[PDB]
Amino acid sequence: MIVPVRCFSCGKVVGDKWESYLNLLQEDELDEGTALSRLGLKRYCCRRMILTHVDLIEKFLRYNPLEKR
Amino acid sequence: EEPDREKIKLLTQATSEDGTSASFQIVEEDHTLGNALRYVIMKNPDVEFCGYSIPHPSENLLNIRIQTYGETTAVDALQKGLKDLMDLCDVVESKFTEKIKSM
Amino acid sequence: NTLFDDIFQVSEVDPGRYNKVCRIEAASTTQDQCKLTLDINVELFPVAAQDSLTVTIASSLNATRSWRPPQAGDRSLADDYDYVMYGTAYKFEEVSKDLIAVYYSFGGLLMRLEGNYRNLNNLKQENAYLLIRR
Amino acid sequence: EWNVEKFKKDFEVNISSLDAREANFDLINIDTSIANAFRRIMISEVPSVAAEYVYFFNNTSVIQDEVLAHRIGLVPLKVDPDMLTWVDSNLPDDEKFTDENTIVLSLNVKCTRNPDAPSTDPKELYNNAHVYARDLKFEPQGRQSTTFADCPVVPADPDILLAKLRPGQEISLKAHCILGIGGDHAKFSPVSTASYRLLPQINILQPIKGESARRFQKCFPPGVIGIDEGSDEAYVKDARKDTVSREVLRYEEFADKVKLGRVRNHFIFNVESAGAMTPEEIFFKSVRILKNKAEYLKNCPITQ
Amino acid sequence: PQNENARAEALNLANTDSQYLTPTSGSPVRGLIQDHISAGVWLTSKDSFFTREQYQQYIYGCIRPEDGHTTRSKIVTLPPTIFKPYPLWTGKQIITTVLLNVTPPDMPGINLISKNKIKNEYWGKGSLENEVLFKDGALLCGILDKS
Ligand SMILES: [Zn+2]
């Protein structure tokens, strides 16, 4: 589903960094370890939450019973 | 005139007749103040025994126990420790103020 | 009152899987029969090999009450000596003729003496101070 | 012989860095019981403002109602405490929230199809397809208009993605943001992480000059050990810089020539923040809580 | 159970305190299991040295007079086993103090000579930590185990 707002272990706000993360991997073309360090994630608790997120909400939203398919 | 009296409680089943030994039970506490206060009561040279004990973690109760030698009851060692921890938070707050005003 | 006193020559200091306790083996310098085997907290009181300790066993310090932490201007027999323990005697053993060996346990830190004459003044009392100078 | 005047002769604070969001500083020669209690209170007992009661009028999106209610509560709000007071729970819900307890946020988002030229990006393709946390607008109730005119209530991180939508779907809610502490729920914790660490102590035992001292460098972070010559050989520059990896204790050259330990009354606090308060101000609150946690026991009758 | 005849038999016949030994061979079935075992090999070790603040904290952490654990209504302690550099209590001396407080005062101490599961050569040359010794209720030698 959507990215968690806070890290589970420390509690830093992590939810505002998912769309900034995908810009760095797509547009700026960095690897995953350098894009996470540029967003400020440095404890490996919060580091593995943007790193390891699936984002299934883009797969759920294809099924919409409120508009013509 | 309603002061709260359900906070600190002298357990009379474990209190000596003289008052040189007494156990207490504070509500809504834990290792936070239970260990910080136990440090300061033990710096009284009349306190023979001091320790806190949390009887169960699922409820907020804190048994502390003070045993003295003499010429100071175990309540007078509790309120001497509570005064020297009030005075110990003044030293921390006033040193840390003077190092922000110095930057 | 002093029950025993001699000067020992440390021959071996074995750490042996511990970090704070070293076993001491020590023969004496005056008599040829009395040995020593002592576990000391070597962190507080470091002992190398070929040292010269002064080992005294006292019965008290000069019907007392109990232990109380030290305070203003109290005087004791422990002031002269650099390392005081307090333990009990649990076993007496005769090795042979004139080789009585006594056993101490300073809270688990064991000790074994040996000799002949000390049977006048080593009872199996649950109070025996042990004090090391130098 | 301890005394509070003898505590004051030997207590120092070195502030290494201070920032809007974090603060690293030292507490020299204080006990572990007191230094833990400041860490203990910064996480739990320091109050902060977060959304507690969420009133959905419609939620036609994919995210559940209680999941989306839970996500609003974790959004940190840039509200100063001591602008609110505490809620009172022994009285019913019509009397419970005032303009002195409560900050009322609201959210009203509808998603619609956008006419755009063409796998296309769903921000160019839909209108309001991403509900960010900055869409929670502040509604001044009562007299929260002359007292919040300097500072409106805005989330501390305004780009938090709260939900995603598709056309037809909508979210229409209204939340009450009450004051609470981190021991009740974690969303009131005013700090990302407050923690301390002891100052490491790196004791060289023998002189290890020369080629051994060059390979003694590499067992540590680079600023820790330094060299000058065979004299001023291999010394500790910054032990505070060291993380205790114990990398030197697994090379058999060095395993007797060094010992690692801590300085047991030198604490290095790293106090971060969730944005609601500056990190040097959730330490002043933390030492004043422990003082006021002791006055309320002194100024109190000893029952029975 | 719903009457007083059955409450007198869940307290006196089928309670856990009378079920210490099983009747299959007479062996005990009740004891501490996994990590209280592996903590008594560190507490009752010879490296354990507690100071005065720590020693009084492990006593009252487990023995509370208010909940009726003691027999004396005043927690009694022992002299330290080190006096002169710094007063330190041994970890075996805590097991002595907890037996000093929960056993009845009129009866004398326990006396026991037993063994451990740990051989002497794991502790070093000339150790006697396989021999458990209690003399007048005082643990004087040996670590405490599953055994
Ligand atoms: Zn984290």
From Swiss-Prot, chain A:
UniProt KW Transcription keyword: yes
Binding site for Zn(2+): 7, 10, 45-46
Localization terms from the record: Nucleus, Nucleolus
Protein keywords: DNA-directed RNA polymerase, Isopeptide bond, Metal-binding, Nucleus, Ribosome biogenesis, Transcription, Ubl conjugation, Zinc
A biological process term (GO) from this entry: transcription elongation by RNA polymerase I
Membrane-spanning ranges: none
Domain of life: Eukaryota
Keyword Metal-binding: yes
InterPro entries (UniProt xref): RNA_pol_su_RPB10, RNA_pol_suN_Zn-BS, RPABC5/Rpb10
Linked residues for Glycyl lysine isopeptide (Lys-Gly) (interchain with G-Cter in ubiquitin): 59
Protein task: DNA-dependent RNA polymerases catalyze the transcription of DNA into RNA using the four ribonucleoside triphosphates as substrates. Common component of RNA polymerases I, II and III which synthesize ribosomal RNA precursors, mRNA precursors and many functional non-coding RNAs, and a small RNAs, such as 5S rRNA and tRNAs, respectively. Pol II is the central component of the basal RNA polymerase II transcription machinery. Pols are composed of mobile elements that move relative to each other. In Pol II, RBP10 is part of the core element with the central large cleft.
Record-stated family: Belongs to the archaeal Rpo10/eukaryotic RPB10 RNA polymerase subunit family.
Name of the protein described by the UniProt record: DNA-directed RNA polymerases I, II, and III subunit RPABC5
Organism annotation: Saccharomyces cerevisiae (strain ATCC 204508 / S288c) (Baker's yeast)
UniProtKB/Swiss-Prot annotation, chain B:
An annotated GO cellular component: RNA polymerase III complex
Subcellular location: Nucleus, Nucleolus
A molecular function GO annotation: protein dimerization activity
The UniProt record lists the keyword Chaperone: no
Keywords: DNA-directed RNA polymerase, Isopeptide bond, Nucleus, Phosphoprotein, Ribosome biogenesis, Transcription, Ubl conjugation
Domain of life: Eukaryota
Disulfide pattern: none
A Gene Ontology BP annotation from the UniProt entry: transcription elongation by RNA polymerase I
Glycyl lysine isopeptide (Lys-Gly) (interchain with G-Cter in ubiquitin) cross-link, chain position(s): 95
Assembly information from the UniProt record: Component of the RNA polymerase I (Pol I) and RNA polymerase III (Pol III) complexes. Component of the RNA polymerase I (Pol I) complex consisting of 14 subunits: RPA135, RPA190, RPC40, RPA14, RPB5, RPO26, RPA43, RPB8, RPA12, RPB10, RPC19, RPC10, RPA49 and RPA34. The complex is composed of a horseshoe-shaped core containing ten subunits (RPA135, RPA190, RPB5, RPO26, RPB8, RPB10, RPC10, RPA12, RPC19 and RPC40) where RPA135 and RPA190 form the DNA-binding cleft.
Purpose: DNA-dependent RNA polymerases catalyze the transcription of DNA into RNA using the four ribonucleoside triphosphates as substrates. Common core component of RNA polymerases I and III which synthesize ribosomal RNA precursors and small RNAs, such as 5S rRNA and tRNAs, respectively.
Family: Belongs to the archaeal Rpo11/eukaryotic RPB11/RPC19 RNA polymerase subunit family.
Miscellaneous comment text of the record: Present with 8680 molecules/cell in log phase SD medium.
Protein name per its UniProtKB record: DNA-directed RNA polymerases I and III subunit RPAC2
Source organism: Saccharomyces cerevisiae (strain ATCC 204508 / S288c)
Swiss-Prot record, chain C:
Keyword presence, Nucleus: yes
Gene Ontology biological process terms from the UniProt entry: nucleolar large rRNA transcription by RNA polymerase I; ribosome biogenesis; RNA-templated transcription; termination of RNA polymerase I transcription; termination of RNA polymerase III transcription; transcription by RNA polymerase I; transcription by RNA polymerase II; transcription by RNA polymerase III
Claim: DNA-binding is one of the keywords in the record: yes
Any one Gene Ontology cellular component term annotated for this protein: nucleoplasm
Gene3D superfamilies the UniProt entry points to: Nucleic acid-binding proteins
Protein name: DNA-directed RNA polymerases I, II, and III subunit RPABC3
Subcellular location: Nucleus
Cited InterPro entries: NA-bd_OB-fold, RPABC3
GO molecular function annotations of the record: DNA binding; DNA-directed RNA polymerase activity
Chain spans, region Non-specific ssDNA binding: 14-37
Entry keywords, A to Z: Acetylation, DNA-binding, DNA-directed RNA polymerase, Nucleus, Phosphoprotein, Ribosome biogenesis, Transcription
Pfam families xref list: RNA_pol_Rpb8 (PF03870)
Function: DNA-dependent RNA polymerases catalyze the transcription. of DNA into RNA using the four ribonucleoside triphosphates as substrates. Common component of RNA polymerases I, II and III which synthesize ribosomal RNA precursors, mRNA precursors and many functional non-coding RNAs, and small RNAs, such as 5S rRNA and tRNAs, respectively.
Major localization listed first in the record, in broad terms: nucleus
Family: Belongs to the eukaryotic RPB8 RNA polymerase subunit family.
Other remarks on this protein: Present with 6210 molecules/cell in log phase SD medium.
UniProtKB/Swiss-Prot annotation, chain D:
Highest taxon of the lineage: Eukaryota
A Pfam family recorded for this sequence: RNA_pol_L
CDD domains recorded: RNAP_I_II_AC40 (cd07032)
Entries under InterPro entries matching the protein: DNA-dir_RNA_pol_30-40kDasu_CS (IPR001514), DNA-dir_RNA_pol_insert (IPR011262), DNA-dir_RNA_pol_RpoA/D/Rpb3 (IPR011263), RBP11-like (IPR036603), RNAP_Rpo3/Rpb3/RPAC1 (IPR022842), RNAPI/III_AC40 (IPR033901), RNApol_insert_sf (IPR036643), Rpo3/RPB3_RNA_Pol_subunit (IPR050518)
Database matches in SUPFAM superfamilies: Insert subdomain of RNA polymerase alpha subunit, RBP11-like subunits of RNA polymerase
GO biological process: nucleolar large rRNA transcription by RNA polymerase I; ribosome biogenesis; termination of RNA polymerase I transcription; termination of RNA polymerase III transcription; transcription by RNA polymerase I; transcription by RNA polymerase III; transcription elongation by RNA polymerase I; transcription initiation at RNA polymerase I promoter
Keyword tags: Acetylation, DNA-directed RNA polymerase, Nucleus, Phosphoprotein, Ribosome biogenesis, Transcription
GO molecular function ontology, one term from the record: DNA-directed RNA polymerase activity
Places the protein is found: Nucleus, Nucleolus
GO cellular component: nucleoplasm; nucleus; RNA polymerase I complex; RNA polymerase III complex
Family per record: Belongs to the archaeal Rpo3/eukaryotic RPB3 RNA polymerase subunit family.
Other noteworthy facts: Present with 13000 molecules/cell in log phase SD medium.
Protein name as it appears in the record: DNA-directed RNA polymerases I and III subunit RPAC1
Biological source species: Saccharomyces cerevisiae (strain ATCC 204508 / S288c)
Gene assigned in the entry: RPC40
